[PDB]
Design a protein around this ligand. Structure first.
Ligand SMILES: *[C@@H]1O[C@H](CO)[C@@H](O[C@@H]2O[C@H](CO)[C@@H](O)[C@H](O)[C@H]2NC(C)=O)[C@H](O)[C@H]1NC(C)=O
Ligand SMILES: *[C@@H]1O[C@H](CO)[C@@H](O[C@@H]2O[C@H](CO)[C@@H](O)[C@H](O)[C@H]2NC(C)=O)[C@H](O)[C@H]1NC(C)=O
Ligand SMILES: *[C@@H]1O[C@H](CO)[C@@H](O[C@@H]2O[C@H](CO)[C@@H](O)[C@H](O)[C@H]2NC(C)=O)[C@H](O)[C@H]1NC(C)=O
Ligand SMILES: *[C@@H]1O[C@H](CO)[C@@H](O[C@@H]2O[C@H](CO)[C@@H](O)[C@H](O)[C@H]2NC(C)=O)[C@H](O)[C@H]1NC(C)=O
Ligand SMILES: *[C@@H]1O[C@H](CO)[C@@H](O[C@@H]2O[C@H](CO)[C@@H](O)[C@H](O)[C@H]2NC(C)=O)[C@H](O)[C@H]1NC(C)=O
Ligand SMILES: *[C@@H]1O[C@H](CO)[C@@H](O)[C@H](O)[C@H]1NC(C)=O
Ligand SMILES: *[C@@H]1O[C@H](CO)[C@@H](O)[C@H](O)[C@H]1NC(C)=O
Ligand SMILES: *[C@@H]1O[C@H](CO)[C@@H](O)[C@H](O)[C@H]1NC(C)=O
Ligand SMILES: *[C@@H]1O[C@H](CO)[C@@H](O)[C@H](O)[C@H]1NC(C)=O
Ligand SMILES: *[C@@H]1O[C@H](CO)[C@@H](O)[C@H](O)[C@H]1NC(C)=O
Ligand SMILES: *[C@@H]1O[C@H](CO)[C@@H](O)[C@H](O)[C@H]1NC(C)=O
Lengths: 36, 289, 49, 120, 49, 49, 49
């Protein structure tokens, strides 16, 4: 490092995986009705 | 015309919080409803002051916030200079009913310099000798003053404010206005207060302070009178106000500055010693030629 | 500058060039976070199979 | 070989004739001392920005200071303040950890964010 | 030495500004892509297109 | 106070020690005449394409 | 005076160029937003989407 820095993303990969899992389980069981 | 004295009225210096006093108008420009961020020699917020009560000699350094409490025009005299003698140019100030009296030259101060009052008052015996000089100038209650000296200019600000509480400094804000300027500069290092009248005065409470370079954030009202000020390098809250240039800060996260760990010492090295010169034979030869 | 005093003083008189640079980069980072949040956080609850 | 940083203990291997390594873009990364012929390494001492978490000037006037991406070993007026906390984002000084779960008010980073009750 | 530092400062400022500008352009491209992805998620996942 | 413009009559009040006002970004907007001591104004004479 | 004025001109030219570039970027983003707004007006207001 030479004065340049990288900042971590606010959402960790585990939470993103949780979002995707929730979306996918909802669309498996409910269909599209859970978007309205 | 002065003598020595016996009753050494030496008292220890008590201490008290400085609070938010010592704000003056830096520039003579008019402004309206703006927050002009400026940096200058100020009295930092929330310090403690070398309170006094014969009268000791104090260093000048950058500046002095020479405040003073009084009833009916008590404090009169001021002596400034480097050596305080006739060898080096000295400065004398006398305040009175009118604005200002100033003399600028070498004098002869003894161990007991005082103006003296006669009871219809006429007495002047602070020094004894005055060889030569050129410049002279003529023009319950807390009397705040400031004494700056920058690049050959001597500046005196002032303010008068009624007070009711006995001991502590007021928890209020009052800016200082520019009063007197002189285009003369001397490398002043010390100053002293003058005593009034043998002298009989022990209840002369004058505070002292010191000024440092830093940055503030003044707020001018619609009439151009300073009514607020926010120090910058005080706490991790005022820094946000300084960097946002606003007095109210919304809920959130703001980046103020950055830090770096500093180096501690040096460990300079060198190649390991090898191949000593054959000076042993030369310096310890069996026989020199 | 890289830990020097004279360089800082010389750069000081160049006006305020760093402030808007940091402003732009901060805007970029906030934009990245907003992008991710709006792409993924399309739902309110957390369902389970 | 002028340079600043910390000199930990390295576990690499130098052939008997090198003197100092480097990694990429001409940055020194290891030195063998000229006397004991052992290899140390160099890591520049840390830096980083700071940030202030405030709940609103009107509501309160106490803040929490975040030191981004810095180990909570050499932080040092807020040298102690409140219970110092360590997180992937950095060292948080002035707020205390809570092992419950709420929504998010002020995104801090790395999967954590703070709010106002003190400051949690 | 002041003049030499001036040269260095000018060069490094130019490089930094160019880097920031390229970052801005690529960020705009990525934001367009993210908007497209959000539209696809809202239209193809949460319903039949 | 070298500058060009038109001088009109104003109503702003100066404390007895200021000389000239300004509004923002270091732009003179008022001045007190050094002889009669009244509050004038300043506006640059108009330009335009 | 030639050298000093050249320095002033170069600095002000750099600042003006940066300002123009930022204006161009912001204009592009605003135009994208305006296209989105026109689409929304033409699809939701003038018919069921
Ligand atoms: C009057 O007193 C002043 C103060 O000592 C003397 O003036 C100094 O003269 C030297 C030599 O030119 C200068 O370097 C100093 O700056 C002067 N100081 C001041 C305060 O003026 C001066 O010699 C004395 N005599 C006369 C006739 O002026
Ligand atoms: C700023 O100064 C002006 C100049 O006098 C003040 O204007 C008037 O002041 C008198 C004296 O108190 C009031 O009776 C008037 O009502 C004021 N008129 C207006 C239009 O303000 C003004 O009050 C001063 N501003 C402040 C905040 O004190
Ligand atoms: C520099 O070289 C000298 C001689 O080669 C080293 O001296 C020997 O070091 C070993 C290892 O510590 C000791 O066991 C010997 O007793 C030392 N002998 C003498 C005569 O000094 C020396 O150690 C080297 N420098 C360093 C820092 O290791
Ligand atoms: C902050 O620094 C300390 C040491 O200064 C780190 O603690 C070391 O951790 C390693 C690996 O867990 C151990 O092998 C050392 O023995 C520890 N040293 C001490 C003195 O405890 C700590 O891990 C660092 N923090 C982070 C987040 O890396
Ligand atoms: C400025 O000098 C002139 C010289 O006379 C004066 O200004 C005006 O003088 C007339 C008389 O011709 C008076 O009626 C005015 O009242 C004066 N104006 C002012 C503002 O005073 C006056 O002596 C000086 N004005 C000053 C010092 O303000
Ligand atoms: C300020 O207060 C502290 C503690 O009250 C005291 O030790 C110190 O001498 C005072 N003065 C200064 C200049 O710190
Ligand atoms: C105050 O000092 C000034 C200047 O020396 C003088 O003109 C005035 O008469 C003095 N007034 C009193 C009351 O001493
Ligand atoms: C102040 O000190 C400087 C030191 O260089 C000297 O040249 C100057 O004459 C001094 N001024 C006074 C008034 O003593
Ligand atoms: C010479 O011999 C003397 C006697 O022991 C000794 O003290 C000195 O260090 C020797 N010097 C050299 C250069 O060998
Ligand atoms: C600011 O805080 C005060 C006290 O907490 C509250 O009364 C006020 O409504 C708040 N203002 C805003 C805009 O939230
Ligand atoms: C963290 O969780 C543990 C349970 O393992 C609990 O005992 C502890 O109180 C929690 N921390 C706080 C600050 O509540």
């Amino acid at each position: 490092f030479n004065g340049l820095t990288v900042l971590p993303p606010l959402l960790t990969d585990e939470m993103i995986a949780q979002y995707t899992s929730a979306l996918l389980a909802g669309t498996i069981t409910s269909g599209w009705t859970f978007g309205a | 015309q002065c003598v020595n004295f016996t009753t050494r009225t030496q008292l220890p210096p008590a201490y008290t919080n400085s609070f938010t006093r010592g704000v003056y108008y830096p520039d003579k420009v008019f402004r309206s409803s703006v927050l002009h961020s400026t940096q200058d020699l100020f009295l930092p917020f929330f310090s403690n002051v070398t309170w006094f009560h014969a009268n000791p000699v104090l260093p000048f350094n950058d500046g002095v916030y020479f405040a003073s409490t009084e009833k009916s025009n008590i404090i009169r005299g001021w002596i400034f200079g480097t050596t305080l003698d006739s060898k080096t140019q000295s400065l004398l100030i006398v305040n009175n009913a009118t604005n200002v009296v100033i003399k600028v030259c070498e004098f002869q101060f003894c161990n007991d310099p005082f103006l003296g009052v006669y009871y219809m008052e006429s007495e002047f015996r602070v020094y004894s000798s005055a060889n030569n000089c050129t410049f002279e100038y003529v023009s319950k209650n807390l009397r705040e003053f400031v004494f700056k000296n920058i690049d050959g200019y001597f500046k005196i600000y002032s303010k008068h404010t009624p007070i009711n509480l006995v001991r502590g400094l007021p928890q209020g804000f009052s800016a200082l206005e520019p009063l007197v300027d002189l285009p003369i500069g001397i490398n002043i290092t010390r100053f002293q207060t003058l005593h009034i009248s043998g002298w009989t005065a022990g209840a002369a409470a004058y505070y002292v302070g010191y000024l440092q370079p830093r940055t503030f954030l003044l707020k001018y009202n619609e009439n151009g009178t300073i009514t607020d000020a926010v120090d910058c390098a005080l706490d991790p809250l005022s820094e946000t106000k300084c960097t946002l240039k606003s007095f109210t800060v919304e809920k959130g996260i703001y980046q103020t500055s950055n830090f770096r760990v500093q180096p501690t010492e040096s460990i300079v090295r060198f190649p390991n010693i090898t191949n000593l010169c054959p000076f042993g034979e030369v310096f310890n030869a069996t026989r020199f030629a | 500058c890289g830990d020097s005093t004279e360089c800082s003083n010389l750069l000081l008189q160049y006006g305020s060039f760093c402030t808007q640079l940091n402003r732009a980069l901060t805007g970029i980072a906030v934009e990245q976070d907003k992008n991710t949040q709006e792409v993924f956080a399309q739902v309110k609850q957390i369902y389970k199979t | 070989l002028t340079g600043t940083g910390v000199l930990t203990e390295s576990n690499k291997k130098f052939l008997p004739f090198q003197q100092f390594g480097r990694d990429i873009a001409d940055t020194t990364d290891a030195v063998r001392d000229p006397q004991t012929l052992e290899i140390l390494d160099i890591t520049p001492c840390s830096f980083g920005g700071v940030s202030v978490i405030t709940p609103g000037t009107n509501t309160s006037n106490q803040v929490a200071v975040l030191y981004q991406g810095v180990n909570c070993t050499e932080v040092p007026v807020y040298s102690t303040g409140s219970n110092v906390f360590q997180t992937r984002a950095g060292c948080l000084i002035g707020a205390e950890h809570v092992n419950n779960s709420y929504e998010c008010d002020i995104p801090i980073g790395a999967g954590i964010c703070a709010s106002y009750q003190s400051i949690i | 030495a002041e003049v030499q530092i001036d040269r260095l400062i000018t060069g490094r400022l130019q490089s930094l500004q160019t880097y920031v500008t390229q970052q801005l352009i690529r960020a705009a491209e990525i934001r367009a892509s993210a908007n497209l992805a959000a539209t696809k998620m809202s239209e193809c996942v949460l319903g039949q297109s």
